[PDB]
Amino acid sequence: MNTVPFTSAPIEVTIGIDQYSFNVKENQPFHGIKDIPIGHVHVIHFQHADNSSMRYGYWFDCRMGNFYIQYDPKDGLYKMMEERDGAKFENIVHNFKERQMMVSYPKIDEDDTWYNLTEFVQMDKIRKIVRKDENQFSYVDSSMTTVQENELSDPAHSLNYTVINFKSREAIRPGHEMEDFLDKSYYLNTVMLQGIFKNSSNYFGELQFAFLNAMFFGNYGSSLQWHAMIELICSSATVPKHMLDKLDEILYYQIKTLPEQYSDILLNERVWNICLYSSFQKNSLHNTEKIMENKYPELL
């Protein structure tokens, strides 16, 4: 079980760790998060009490290094850092645990929620979508734009999601205009799966990572990407049975976890109505259709 210590908490902040969160007061003796489950990526995240515009966080995997948080009073944020000295790090963590200054990652034994949301999400793939090669962890915030959003400005601070555009030469073979526009199977199976992602696991990873950045940071471009990746599957007549069954599980857990009060901003009425009621796959997403109809019948 791994640990992300904090040097201190000089400003009042709501701290998220995956789907959990807790309030820390200004100068509260808080020194970090322990018992973090090994085997999954994690996201620590922050919303300052004095300024909710400051909404930002770090994707990391404790298997890749020893990470800590330190407040920077100049840039006015909690920064993730790597400690390269294993023995110093162990010595710091041991002291804070002895003085019980750390909150425990509050996982219920029964509860597969985080696994179900991050099944296909890999740190190596996050580090390609979020490009900062000197760090093993990835910074995301509410304002960061996507490569596709920047085409329609600063490229070093962008989310390099795979561009999906239904009215693009990539999506439409010359001479198959109607066929490829009305049935996106070509674009899904040949261009995206075989061509770009290589497999359905990389496609699901991105999709899951887009959702989590939409949910945890209110990142609008991430929400666009999540919906585009759902729509591209739902709008394809020919999808492998294993991919449809898996998509149903992925979307079920995403809809399960979504805070009820953010459903209005985080769900696109057109995509969900098309996917569940109009599309080729309208009858392929049983679990997702049932949770959507019971939790958000107004959107539909």
Binding site: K167, S168, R169, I172, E177, M178, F181, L182
Partner: protein, 253 residues
């Protein structure tokens, strides 16, 4: 964005543009079967592709053979329209290619945009204007070339005959839309007005009769009366009670 009453003069500027109307592409007669079911029988159709500045009409005749063994024909008709418009643009020399294509029906936007991906600098626009181009098949010579076709054919016309010798494009378009609106509202009455006086003929190389400037004023008035006469018998409105400002509005409306 959208082509409306606000930006109407744009039609007659020196930027090449085409209207595309797909109303007459897929045409059927609905009939009873021997077992008392209903069936359709397709008849020849046409794409109406018009340069509003020059009057050049690219009439692509859609032969019923296009539909053989196809499903969802009303959907296919939009994509076939978009295919044939994109083929027409590719056939034109670069200096003749349009800078904009205005579709009369919003359902043509996606099909045309997808077929024209190769032409990112050609704007595909809807219009708020309710244009009467469906009535093209009430022009006898256009109806005749469509119904005689035994194969796919493109036929080139000037829908303004020689009017641009005497009037501006703006006035020519206004005359065309009034004639087509009348033909669309009451075909029999409109044809009567156009062809009653047998001394005024249609030249072999023209679509409409050879009216003098004064005769066009009388014809234009007779068409405007017909559109109000019909808008009267439609809504049960005493038209003789209407003033000139409220008359003006209803042809536009």
């Amino acid at each position: 964005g959208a082509m409306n009453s606000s930006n109407y003069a744009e039609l007659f500027n020196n930027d090449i543009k085409l209207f595309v109307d797909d109303t007459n592409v897929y045409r059927v007669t609905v009939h009873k079967t021997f077992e008392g079911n209903v069936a359709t029988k397709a008849i020849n159709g046409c794409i109406f592709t018009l340069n509003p500045k020059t009057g050049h009409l690219f009439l692509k005749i859609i032969h019923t053979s296009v539909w053989a063994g196809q499903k969802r024909l009303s959907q296919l008709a939009k994509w076939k329209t978009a295919e044939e418009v994109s083929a027409l643009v590719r056939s034109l020399p670069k200096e003749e290619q349009p800078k904009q294509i205005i579709v009369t029906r919003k359902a043509m936007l996606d099909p045309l945009e997808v077929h024209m991906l190769d032409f990112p600098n050609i704007a595909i626009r809807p219009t708020e204007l309710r244009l009467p181009f469906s009535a093209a098949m009430s022009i006898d010579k256009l109806s005749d070339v469509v119904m005689k076709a035994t194969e796919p054919q493109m036929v080139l016309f000037n829908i303004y005959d020689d009017w641009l010798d005497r009037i501006s494009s703006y006035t020519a378009f206004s005359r065309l839309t009034l004639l087509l609106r009348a033909l669309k509202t009451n075909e029999e009455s409109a044809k009567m007005i156009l062809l009653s006086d047998p001394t005024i003929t249609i030249k072999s190389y023209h679509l409409w009769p050879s009216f003098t400037d004064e005769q066009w004023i009388t014809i234009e008035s007779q068409m405007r009366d017909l559109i109000l006469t019909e808008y009267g018998r439609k809504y049960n409105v005493n038209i003789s009670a209407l003033t000139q400002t409220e008359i003006k509005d209803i042809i536009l409306g």
